[PDB]
Inverse folding.
């Protein structure tokens, strides 16, 4: 078992907003992505605008201040740090992607589900059905379900 948050109340903050989407659509996608994980664990997530936010959500491009530089449009879509203080837990999204509420460009919701999985301590899954599989693929939000493997993984960390 890798690092996990040692509390069940976890805050997040949206540092900045991609211009690709309306602001309310970014809020909604991120909120719904957290809800995917709280639906199957004892964890609760609250959005705050300053202060001690555990998970900082950031949109940035190329070299952006950590050791995980982005690569322009395509390739790496986002990355996130596992539980820990400071940069720990933070989720970074490559602004060179075109973020969407839908199937065009890169769907922010699904990518956020994957990245939050990392922010909570999950590694990649070798199961192609799992949201933690390494490669992105689109599916409608209304049809999306965590896989049994994703649920096994997150419940092994938090119950
Ligand atoms: N196919 C690709 O490789 C794409 C885009 C290609 C491009 O335009 O160059 N890039 C990415 O995928 C990069 C790859 C980084 C690397 O090269 O290793 N991945 C990263 O950046 C990881 C981020 C990521 C992965 C996912 C994901 C979404 C849905 C499912 C899902 C599971 C089951 C059923 C269904 Cl329908 C969907 C699984 C994973 N969201 O954000
Ligand atoms: Ca943090
Ligand atoms: Ca990229
Ligand atoms: Ca963009
Ligand atoms: Zn980063
Ligand atoms: Zn990943």
């Amino acid at each position: 078992m890798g690092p996990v948050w040692r509390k069940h109340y976890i805050t997040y903050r949206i540092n900045n907003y991609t211009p690709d989407m309306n602001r309310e659509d970014v809020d909604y996608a991120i909120r719904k992505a957290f809800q995917v994980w709280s639906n199957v664990t004892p964890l609760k997530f609250s959005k705050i605008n300053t202060g001690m936010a555990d998970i900082l959500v950031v949109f940035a491009r190329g070299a952006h201040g950590d050791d995980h530089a982005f690569d322009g449009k395509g390739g790496i879509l986002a990355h996130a740090f596992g539980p820990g203080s400071g940069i720990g837990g933070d989720a970074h999204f490559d602004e060179d992607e075109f973020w969407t509420t839908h199937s065009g460009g890169t769907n922010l919701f699904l990518t956020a589900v994957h990245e939050i999985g990392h922010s909570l301590g999950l590694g990649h899954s070798s199961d192609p059905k799992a949201v933690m599989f390494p490669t992105y693929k689109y599916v409608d939000i209304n049809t999306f379900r965590l896989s049994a493997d994703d649920i096994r993984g997150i419940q092994s960390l938090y119950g």
About this structure: Strands lie at 9-14, 44-47, 55-60, 78-80, 91-94, 99-100, 106-107. Residues 96 and 107 are 13 Å apart (CA to CA). The first helix runs from residue 23 to 38. The chain has three helices and seven strands.
